[PDB]
């Protein structure tokens, strides 16, 4: 009998000692909860080092969706550590030593005497408007949780500030690498002239929602369809059907 | 739809400040249930039963019946015609109703006033209240048309004092 | 009892000597079919639920402020009936208690 | 200049090195800052002109010294919210956030002077805006005084906020000897490597730990934990009054149950203690928008600022007269 | 004061809201509610 | 705490440190051939690892110049917490509060295993459930909310989103519940001096009956005694009058409630006219709240417009309404009322807005806990008029609750339908 009184003050002190535990990732889901979606935990620059070593190995396995699922950051922080990573190997193979990084490892081995903001998924900020409608007498029915159509809501605006930053980032990186001109006596002429970008304009000239089609000119008289710069030029000129979200 | 405004004329509703009362309304077959009308009651109760807002539900009958049962007529034609399933679908539609009816969250209230037999007293006495008038008149004639007190009719006519049950459910 | 806590002072034999309640009642049961005192008004004043019998000729500020009407002509008869039946209520749900 | 605007507003808002003469200028200015707020209770222009006036003077001097109402006023809009929200995207105040440079006039000196970069072209606009995608960096012969600054910064910022205040409280004139010792070792890379690996602060860092742990309670964290674990907590008095009841009918297990229950008791029903020692002021980092590798340094843009985490010294109660925000939500609202 | 209602709505609003600590006859009203009846038109008929 | 001594140890330790590594690391390189120019001359005078040298230059010629009491105390720089201002003598009290029923505790438990027979085990373990049941009580609230944190350690997705939703707003709740409950005396204070209330409370309750019984059982001997014991029991019940009356007044201490914020709207002076002259008074008009749907107001006359402004103080919390918010930040419709000639117009906004409003309807809005709302005071400007018309005005808002109870209808915001 007293062997069950035994086990009983086992599973007692297995909880007493480990009070202290369960109070953290209380902390730890606190800070989830009064900031909703705020990862509470701080990402490391060796977990950066390690997602960049994931995605230069398996890129068709560790994808972004994958890694920032895995390390609970959104995909467009991601893209800056990858796009950071390779920076920083291309600075270390031009000096040929790796390069300090005293401030990297002080916060990764202090996060406590700092504080961190990193998110995890993006939360919609809703004009809590008030707008009512008076249901029927006799309606069956049930009404929407109004979590529910915030998820909707923000994983909407979630999808559309991704692929927002998509576009202005890759231009950004080859504007980065060299291939847009951005200063006015780095645009020249050829040897032949200028080559145009033709837009037809109009109702039958519209190659859908967002303005009309495209084509080149050549200056030697040749006409082509758009490359895949120009064509990013055709997709970040287009007006957007929305408010400016952030 | 526009084809269900009948429907909805059979099963009113009425909205107090916390309750919900469901009116009974077929005037030629003195409100007797259909298929229907037994999805629709079923329908209403669940979602007020899920509603936080609502405090109790009702069930009454508008005339001089509160409900003479089922609509047999119906399943009597469809067995004519050979195929059996509508009377199938009719039959766990409403001992669904009475399972509903007599597992309910909220207090529920019937106001029997009139004539109730067979389902009708099936959808309302499995309930918490049950309030009866000076023109609530209980008949159980289910022998007397070949077929037998269902609906729940087993369950509380069986568990009357003494023998009454058997007496209610032989003779009607 | 507005003001329960004001000072009282002995001065003779007079009218006799009586101070307010210590405590704030948590109901007034009213008999004042003339309105003589100020009950209904000082119970609606502070929050205090008020049993009242009613004429038919009573005013509507003092109808609005009670919370327990009893439409009744208030006979000898019937306020013995009402207090015989407020008493065994009372005592009755006291028993249950073992007071 | 600026240490006088302290006794403008009544507490130090200059950011150098004090002098014994200001700190005790500051302590009475302190004094009237807290016999102020007593006596708000009979003051009919508290909220509308004085709370207002000295909230738009602490946010001018945050921003390095702008005309706040003027630019405010410039939009019809009653609260400050889109335009503190539009203010923390501009190419200044981003690298006073990303602490490449210690004030808003040192970031306005190096952008107007051609030396930052967005997206490796130089941009010497200092109020322009970076939505998220932009790449900043500095240019290739200034970057590495840029990251020599960045680490003293970060290694005199621990010697300087973490190491004086957290369990070091020395009185002035002998922590300022005591500084000299404490900048020598931080002359080498060996000195700041042993420093970073240290049981000194590893102790420190417990400390710490305990301390943001203890502060959760105000928010009745140790209620959410003994909600979470009721049926245990439950299950061990269960278990006690079983044993007590049956090993007693016809003494170590009774002293070991009564000890942990009392244990478990003390530990889910004590209140919180907020105790005399001041809280240490940490600094902020913007990783909710903004990316950065220190090593260059290089950062990106990637999302927008939060109006909630804006670091700046304002009370709630204060700052919401002009922001007007719904706190608690966590959203830009 | 300036709410509305009778003295059992007003003062569940008020408990509700924290504004007044509940009173002792608050749960006597609401086990025994005081009576209503519908209206009545105000036409007296002579008897 | 630390020593300073051991502060100084322990940076003579690392330093110490150092060299030791330098030492060892050089020895290891020495011995295995390999000349030591980058331990010589590069961590010695050419590291320069911060650039703090001119600082440490800087520094030291500041050490030597002045002399003070060198242990001297002074206002440290980075000061100004600013919400280190709560009384230390009630968070003081709440520390031995806690103690002595912890203690109280301890001390049924310990009882509890003093027993000999079971109807007494019964006996205490009914005195232990009425004390847990009293003291250390955990509210329900906190159970909901712990069986939901159980769900979201584990979920994911919609699911993590969705709770992470209902816990914040569960956690508001309960937060603004244990600061704002009327029922605990926590919640309270004393203002200015003009369980333990409980009991002082307690105490003279049990007073004034025993005085009440001695008053009417010497009433009693008075009425049928005549002559000079007549005026010996007279004097005996105008002491024992005195006694109450006293008692009476040391009940009446008025209490404010912690959490809420007062503020002058309007002080006066007016005037009344004596053939000596003018009698010039004070009348002071202020409003509170709790900045979460609770405000309230009063007027005082006095004297001083101090005395007058305390006067109302008192009397502010006695008058206290509950305000129906929509969403914490905003009213549910478009309101307009009139308070004598003060008309008032109220317009809900969406959630970055702000408040426009003049000073008086500002500050009634401001604690009532309003973000979001625009308003306009249409001919008179009274302001004791303009208070009433406020309080007017939103207690004649129609919330959709209200609508829902009134027409017997689900009423559902447009956005989730
Ligand atoms: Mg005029």
Known sequence: ?246 | ?172 | ?99 | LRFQTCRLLLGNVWNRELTIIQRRILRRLRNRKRSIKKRKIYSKKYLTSYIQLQTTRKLSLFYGDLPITEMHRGTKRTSYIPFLLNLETRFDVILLRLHFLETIPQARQLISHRRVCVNKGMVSITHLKLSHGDIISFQENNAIIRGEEIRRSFYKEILVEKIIGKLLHQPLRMWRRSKTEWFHLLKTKRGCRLLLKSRFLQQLRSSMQEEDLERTKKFGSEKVCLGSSFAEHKRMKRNLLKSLFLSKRRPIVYNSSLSLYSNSTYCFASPHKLTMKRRIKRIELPTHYLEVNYRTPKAVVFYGPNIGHIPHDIRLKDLNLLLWSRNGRGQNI | ?47 | ?417
């Open chain 5, 1 to 47: 004061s300036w709410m509305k209602g009778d003295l059992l709505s007003k003062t569940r609003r008020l408990v509700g809201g924290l504004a007044t600590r509940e009173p002792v006859w608050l749960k006597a009203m609401e086990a025994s509610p005081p009576p209503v009846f519908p209206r009545s038109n105000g036409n007296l008929k002579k008897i």
């Open chain 2, 1 to 172: 739809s526009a084809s269900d405004a009948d429907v909805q004329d059979q099963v009113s509703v009425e909205g107090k400040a916390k309750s919900r009362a469901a009116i009974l309304d077929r005037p030629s077959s003195l409100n007797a249930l259909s298929a229907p009308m037994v999805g629709r009651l079923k329908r209403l109760y669940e979602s007020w039963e899920e509603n936080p807002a609502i405090s109790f539900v009702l069930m009454k009958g508008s005339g001089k019946t509160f409900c003479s049962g089922a609509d047999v007529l119906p399943l009597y034609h469809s067995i004519n015609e050979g195929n059996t399933e509508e009377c199938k679908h009719f039959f766990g539609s409403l001992y669904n109703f009475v399972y509903l009816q007599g597992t309910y969250l909220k207090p529920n209230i019937a106001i029997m006033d009139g004539v109730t037999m067979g389902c009708g007293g099936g959808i309302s006495i499995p309930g918490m209240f049950r309030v009866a008038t000076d023109k609530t008149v209980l008949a159980h004639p289910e022998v007397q048309i070949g077929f037998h007190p269902d609906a729940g009719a087993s369950y509380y006519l069986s568990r009357l004092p003494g023998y009454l049950g058997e007496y209610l459910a032989l003779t009607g």
């Open chain 1, 1 to 246: 009998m007293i062997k069950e009184i035994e086990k009983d003050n086992r599973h007692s002190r297995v909880f007493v000692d480990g009070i202290k535990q369960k109070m953290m990732e209380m902390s730890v889901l606190l800070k989830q909860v009064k900031e909703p979606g705020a990862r509470g935990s701080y990402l490391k620059d060796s977990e950066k080092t390690e997602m960049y070593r994931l995605h230069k190995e398996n890129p068709e396995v560790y994808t972004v969706e994958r890694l920032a699922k895995d390390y609970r950051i959104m995909r467009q922080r991601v893209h800056a550590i990858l796009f950071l990573k390779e920076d920083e190997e291309e600075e270390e193979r031009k000096l040929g030593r790796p390069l300090d990084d005293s401030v990297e490892r002080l916060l990764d081995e202090y996060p406590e005497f700092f504080v961190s903001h990193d998110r995890e998924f993006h939360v919609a900020s809703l004009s809590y408007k008030p707008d009512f409608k008076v249901m029927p007498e006799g309606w069956d029915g049930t009404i929407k949780d109004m979590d529910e159509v915030h998820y909707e809501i923000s994983k909407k605006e979630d999808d559309i500030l991704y692929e927002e930053f998509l576009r202005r980032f890759e231009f950004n990186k080859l504007k980065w690498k060299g291939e847009v001109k951005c200063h006015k006596y780095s645009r020249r002429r050829s040897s032949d002239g200028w080559k145009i970008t033709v837009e037809k304009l109009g109702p039958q000239g519209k190659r859908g929602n967002g303005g009309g089609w495209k084509f080149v000119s050549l200056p030697d008289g040749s006409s082509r369809p758009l490359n895949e710069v120009e064509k990013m030029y055709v997709k970040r000129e287009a007006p957007r059907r929305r408010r400016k979200i952030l």
């Open chain 3, 1 to 99: 009892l507005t003001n329960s806590y004001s000072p009282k002072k002995f001065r003779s034999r007079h009218k006799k000597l009586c101070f307010g309640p210590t405590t704030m009642p948590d109901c007034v049961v009213v008999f004042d079919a003339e309105r003589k005192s100020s009950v209904v008004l000082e119970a609606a004043k502070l929050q205090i639920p008020v049993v009242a019998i009613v004429d038919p000729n009573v005013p509507l500020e003092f109808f609005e402020k009670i919370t327990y009407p009893v439409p009744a002509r208030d006979s000898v008869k019937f306020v013995y009936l009402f207090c015989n039946v407020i008493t065994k209520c009372f005592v009755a749900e006291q028993m249950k208690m073992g007071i």
């Open chain 6, 1 to 417: 705490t630390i020593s300073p001594a051991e502060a100084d140890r322990v940076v003579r330790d690392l330093l110490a440190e150092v060299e030791k590594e330098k030492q060892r690391e050089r020895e290891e390189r020495q011995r295995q051939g390999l000349d030591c120019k980058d331990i010589d001359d590069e961590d010695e005078d050419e590291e320069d690892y911060l650039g703090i040298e001119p600082f440490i230059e800087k520094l030291k010629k500041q050490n030597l110049k002045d002399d003070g009491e060198l242990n001297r105390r002074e206002e440290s720089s980075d000061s100004d917490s600013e919400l280190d201002e709560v009384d230390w003598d009630e968070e003081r009290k709440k520390e031995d509060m806690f103690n002595k029923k912890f203690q109280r505790h301890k001390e049924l438990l310990q009882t509890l295993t003093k027993s000999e027979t079971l109807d007494e085990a019964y006996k205490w373990m009914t005195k232990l459930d009425k004390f847990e049941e009293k003291h250390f009580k955990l509210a329900p609230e906190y159970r909901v909310i712990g069986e939901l944190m159980n769900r979201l350690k584990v979920a994911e997705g919609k699911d993590k989103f969705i709770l992470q939703q209902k816990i914040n707003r569960a956690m508001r709740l309960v937060e603004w519940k244990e600061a704002f409950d009327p029922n605990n005396p926590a919640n309270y204070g004393v203002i200015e001096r003009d369980d333990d209330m409980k009991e002082r409370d307690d105490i003279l309750l049990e007073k004034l009956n025993a005085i009440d019984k001695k008053l009417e059982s010497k009433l009693s001997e008075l009425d049928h005694t005549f002559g000079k014991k007549g005026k010996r029991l007279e004097e005996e019940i105008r002491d024992l009058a005195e006694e109450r009356n006293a008692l009476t007044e040391k009940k009446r201490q008025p209490l404010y409630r912690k959490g809420y914020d007062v503020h002058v709207i309007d002080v006066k002076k007016v005037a009344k006219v004596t053939k000596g002259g003018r009698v010039e008074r004070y009348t002071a008009l202020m409003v509170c709240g709790n900045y979460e749907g609770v405000i309230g107001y009063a007027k005082a006359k006095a004297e001083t417009g101090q005395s007058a402004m305390q006067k109302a103080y008192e009397k502010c919390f006695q008058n206290l309404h509950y305000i129906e918010r929509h969403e914490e930040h905003t009213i549910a419709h478009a309101i307009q009322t009139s308070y004598k000639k003060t008309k008032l117009y109220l317009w809900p906004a969406p959630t970055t807005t702000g408040m426009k409003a003049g000073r008086v309807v500002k500050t009634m809005l401001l604690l009532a806990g309003f973000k979001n709302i625009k308003s306009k005071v249409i001919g008179s400007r009274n302001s004791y008029n303009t208070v009433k018309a406020v309080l007017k005005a939103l207690n004649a808002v129609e919330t959709p609750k209200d609508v829902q109870e009134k027409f017997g209808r689900t009423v559902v915001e447009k956005y989730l339908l």
